[PDB]
Amino acid sequence: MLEARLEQASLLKRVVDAIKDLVQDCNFDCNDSGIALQAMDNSHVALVSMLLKAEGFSAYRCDRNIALGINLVSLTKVLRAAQNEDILTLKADDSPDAVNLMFESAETDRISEYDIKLMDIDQEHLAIPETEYAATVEMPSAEFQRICRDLNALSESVVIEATKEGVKFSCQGDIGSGSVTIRQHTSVDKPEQNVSIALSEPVALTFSLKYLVNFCKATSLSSKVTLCLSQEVPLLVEYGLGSGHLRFYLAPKIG
Amino acid sequence: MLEARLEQASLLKRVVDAIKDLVQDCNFDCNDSGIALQAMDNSHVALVSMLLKAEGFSAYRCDRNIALGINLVSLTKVLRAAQNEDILTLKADDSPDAVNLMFESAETDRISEYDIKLMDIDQEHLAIPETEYAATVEMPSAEFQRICRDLNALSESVVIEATKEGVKFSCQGDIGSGSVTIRQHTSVDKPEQNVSIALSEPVALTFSLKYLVNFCKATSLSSKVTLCLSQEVPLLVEYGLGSGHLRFYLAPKI
Amino acid sequence: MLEARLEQASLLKRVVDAIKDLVQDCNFDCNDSGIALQAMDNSHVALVSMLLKAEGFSAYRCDRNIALGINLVSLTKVLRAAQNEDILTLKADDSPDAVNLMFESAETDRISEYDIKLMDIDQEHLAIPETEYAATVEMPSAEFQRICRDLNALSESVVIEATKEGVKFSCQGDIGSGSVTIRQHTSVDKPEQNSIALSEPVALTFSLKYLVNFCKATSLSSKVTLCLSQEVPLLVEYGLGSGHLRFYLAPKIGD
Amino acid sequence: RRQTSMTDFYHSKR
Amino acid sequence: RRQTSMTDFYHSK
Amino acid sequence: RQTSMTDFYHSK
Numbered sequence: 001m002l003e004a005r006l007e008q009a010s011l012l013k014r015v016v017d018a019i020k021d022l023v024q025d026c027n028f029d030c031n032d033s034g035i036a037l038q039a040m041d042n043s044h045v046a047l048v049s050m051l052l053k054a055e056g057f058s059a060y061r062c063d064r065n066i067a068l069g070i071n072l073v074s075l076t077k078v079l080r081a082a083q084n085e086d087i088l089t090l091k092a093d094d095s096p097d098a099v100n101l102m103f104e105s106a107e108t109d110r111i112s113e114y115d116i117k118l119m120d121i122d123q124e125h126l127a128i129p130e131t132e133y134a135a136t137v138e139m140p141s142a143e144f145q146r147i148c149r150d151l152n153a154l155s156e157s158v159v160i161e162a163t164k165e166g167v168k169f170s171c172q173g174d175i176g177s178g179s180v181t182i183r184q185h186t187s188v189d190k191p192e193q194n195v196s197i198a199l200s201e202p203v204a205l206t207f208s209l210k211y212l213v214n215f216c217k218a219t220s221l222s223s224k225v226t227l228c229l230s231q232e233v234p235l236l237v238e239y240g241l242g243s244g245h246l247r248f249y250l251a252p253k254i255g
Numbered sequence: 256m257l258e259a260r261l262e263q264a265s266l267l268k269r270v271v272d273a274i275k276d277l278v279q280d281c282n283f284d285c286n287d288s289g290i291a292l293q294a295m296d297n298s299h300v301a302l303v304s305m306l307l308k309a310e311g312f313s314a315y316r317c318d319r320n321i322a323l324g325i326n327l328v329s330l331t332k333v334l335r336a337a338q339n340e341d342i343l344t345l346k347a348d349d350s351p352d353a354v355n356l357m358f359e360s361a362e363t364d365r366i367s368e369y370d371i372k373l374m375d376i377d378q379e380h381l382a383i384p385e386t387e388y389a390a391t392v393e394m395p396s397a398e399f400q401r402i403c404r405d406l407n408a409l410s411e412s413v414v415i416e417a418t419k420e421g422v423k424f425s426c427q428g429d430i431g432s433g434s435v436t437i438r439q440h441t442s443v444d445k446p447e448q449n450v451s452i453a454l455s456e457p458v459a460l461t462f463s464l465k466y467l468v469n470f471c472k473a474t475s476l477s478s479k480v481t482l483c484l485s486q487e488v489p490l491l492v493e494y495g496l497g498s499g500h501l502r503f504y505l506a507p508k509i
Numbered sequence: 510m511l512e513a514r515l516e517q518a519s520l521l522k523r524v525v526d527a528i529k530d531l532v533q534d535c536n537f538d539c540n541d542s543g544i545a546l547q548a549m550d551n552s553h554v555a556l557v558s559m560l561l562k563a564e565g566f567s568a569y570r571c572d573r574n575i576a577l578g579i580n581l582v583s584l585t586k587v588l589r590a591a592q593n594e595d596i597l598t599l600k601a602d603d604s605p606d607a608v609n610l611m612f613e614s615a616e617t618d619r620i621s622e623y624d625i626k627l628m629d630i631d632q633e634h635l636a637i638p639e640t641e642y643a644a645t646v647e648m649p650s651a652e653f654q655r656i657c658r659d660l661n662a663l664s665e666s667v668v669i670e671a672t673k674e675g676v677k678f679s680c681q682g683d684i685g686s687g688s689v690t691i692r693q694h695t696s697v698d699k700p701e702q703n704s705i706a707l708s709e710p711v712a713l714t715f716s717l718k719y720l721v722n723f724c725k726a727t728s729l730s731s732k733v734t735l736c737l738s739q740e741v742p743l744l745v746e747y748g749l750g751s752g753h754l755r756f757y758l759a760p761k762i763g764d
Numbered sequence: 765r766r767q768t769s770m771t772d773f774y775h776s777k778r
Numbered sequence: 779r780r781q782t783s784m785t786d787f788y789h790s791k
Numbered sequence: 792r793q794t795s796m797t798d799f800y801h802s803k
Contacts (some may be wrong), residue, residue, distance in 0.1 A: 035767065044769045074684040081659035081689070092770020098450060098685060108653075108701075109675070109692030113662075117687045126774040143365075150336035150367075173331040178336070178369040185364055193362065233773055251772065299795045381800040398619070405590035405621070421618075431607055433590070433623040442619050448617075453625045463793065489799055506794040572786045635784060636791035715783065739789055757783040 002092035005058035010084030018218035020072035027067040038125050046211050047249040056243035069121040070249045078114045089109045134230035135162035136198040141225040145216035147180045152209040154178050162206045192223045206253040215248040256346040257285050258316045265339035273473035281321040282378045282492040293380050301466050311498025312406035324376035333369045343485035389458045393451035396480040400471035402435045407464040407491035409433050418457045447478045458484045459509040470503040511601040512538050514568040519593035527726035531583035536632045537577040547634045549696025555719050556757040578630040587623045643738035644671040645706040650733040654724035656689050661717040670712035698733035711737045714761040723756040
């Protein structure tokens with residue numbers, strides 16, 4: 001039934017690395033559109049939504065929808081044996097008990113093959129309607145990661161404030177208080193340094209910094225990150241994949 | 256009151272990293288001359304004396320002398336948030352309860368601001384008279400650091416022996432005994448890597464290796480270190496800063 | 510009695526690093542042929558046999574045979590104080606209580622001297638006859654190390670199975686089953702070569718933790734040789750230039 | 765005072 | 779099922 | 792024995 005091939009294995013490895021520390025056991029839902037994933041963490045504070053579209057694969061074939069329950073720690077152990085360059089192929093049969101992974105290297109004749117046992121996972125999926133966000137901030141992913149780490153050194157919580165001016169991340173803790181302010185910045189030379197802010201109405205929300213630091217482990221998937229905020233819904237942190245996407249949703253702190 | 260601007264935030268980061276493991280809570284005494292520091296460890300075995308001269312800041316202003324009591328671990332947590340090249344600004348008010356740190360980068364217009372709460376530190380300062388040392392050794396800081404780590408792997412104490420020929424560091428321990436001998440070495444090609452000995456009379460002293468290893472965390476501040484020895488005075492280990500200095504004093508074992 | 514001078518301190522450091530996690534306390538037997546070592550691990554499952562030939566020293570002199578009993582952890586502590594390019598000199602007398610180490614550097618005039626106390630070790634040496642192996646595989650040491658780590662993440666045991674076409678490493682475990690197949694590959698390349706000399710096919714099972722310990726000798730040579738036959742332990746050999754470092758691994762039987 | 769849950773905002777689906 | 783020993787194959791010398 | 796810094800310099 002299922003045969004899904006990546007030209008570069010890196011895409012899968014980073015994706016797994018960007019998910020496994022937030023949620024360990026996930027169902028990869030496979031259909032004609034591709035391979036999707038949605039999972040909440042054990043505390044139900046964050047939600048991961050991944051889509052790897054059939055467009056990104058050499059050869060996508062799936063006549064029957066199937067949920068592949070995978071422990072991502074085991075998957076990471078197996079994926080460590082594949083280089084970023086390796087040609088990767090997932091295969092699965094009709095009512096599968098395991099997923100077959102094949103890594104092929106060039107100029108070597110070396111072939112690696114693994115049969116990873118699947119597991120039964122009861123994953124609570126949520127319906128997320130399309131939202132028109134009050135604020136959308138596109139910024140360098142490494143910059144957001146640096147800000148998150150820096151403020152996490154000082155506090156458990158961060159206030160994100162989006163106004164026409166710019167975006168302010170602020171925190172308070174025993175050591176004192178800190179803040180990082182970014183203004184929308186356009187570079188003629190190098191546009192990965194760009195910060196764009198599309199804002200219909202100002203918005204201010206508080207979030208857990210450890211969850212954001214976990215989110216930022218997807219930095220290797222894209223040089224750009226998009227933060228979508230509005231007052232009454234969880235924060236959206238989106239990384240584009242080229243042909244798919246990885247989204248993290250974070251419920252706010254209120255009191 | 257106080258507004259002091261550093262060109263590379265790196266200098267302050269190196270200094271704090273070079274002090275924090277010997278003394279955690281320090282008073283930064285700020286006056287027209289600049290920012291100074293003197294502190295003993297809790298055992299009163301070692302003494303740190305830092306001076307950052309006002310000339311080294313790209314705008315130094317201090318209207319009234321003030322001691323900023325800072326926990327250097329918290330300060331390190333805050334200072335990691337600045338790259339070595341960030342433009343750094345310290346500020347403080349009249350009866351300050353906190354120190355304001357501001358990090359600025361070019362081509363971004365990104366602003367980082369932190370307000371670190373100050374703490375009350377009761378400063379016991381010691382009078383250090385100018386001394387004419389029996390021996391003065393100029394050597395690569397990295398070489399001294401390697402020697403200290405190597406001998407610390409085997410022993411808690413090191414004997415330092417300065418003669419006209421050279422300097423011997425020796426130690427003994429359960430595994431056995433070790434020693435490193437350096438001679439006066441002058442290269443025209445790479446003089447970062449020179450060894451100078453100015454000696455009026457030979458000198459032999461014993462010191463704690465853990466304290467010297469702590470001292471050597473200042474290696475990043477200068478490729479060069481100076482060791483000053485005489486029998487009746489503590490050892491002086493000095494790192495030049497360009498616009499100031501960082502000195503460590505170590506009482507001997509007798 | 511004993512004075513042995515190495516031009517590069519690196520050789521001894523790497524060699525000790527490749528042994529200490531397998532056997533901690535070793536006798537260095539010094540004679541006119543050079544410095545040899547043979548030691549079994551505490552479980553008697555693996556055996557290390559090192560020879561540093563007298564030819565590899567810039568001055569080797571041994572008036573009387575001597576067994577230098579050395580704790581390799583202490584030896585590593587002392588050898589860390591020498592850079593890879595330091596001129597190293599070992600000295601010992603007739604009835605020694607310690608070994609004298611001298612490190613000298615060029616363009617510096619700094620001399621380091623250490624006297625490591627010896628210890629009394631009763632090491633059981635085994636007679637290993639010259640063997641004609643059913644299969645001899647020459648392959649890049651880094652590749653073998655990577656394979657060993659990858660499979661050790663997944664299993665306790667590995668089946669090494671050699672045929673005329675190529676060599677298969679396979680494993681089984683709770684996560685599933687895996688395999689890496691290398692084919693005989695002759696490119697001018699350099700250390701990418703992979704050669705199999707085989708009289709009869711052979712398949713044996715071995716402990717992966719011991720092989721991972723073996724692979725700590727990777728820094729000694731870009732090439733590793735695996736020698737297999739059905740009735741004797743596996744031989745994993747790293748050439749030294751000066752002699753050799755061999756590891757022997759007894760197989761697992763009756764799976 | 766309260767860390768909200770994702771299920772506070774979005775309903776369960778199949 | 780059984781990890782053999784080096785001493786199963788080579789005798790002491 | 793390990794001496795103290797206050798044995799060499801007075802407090803001021």
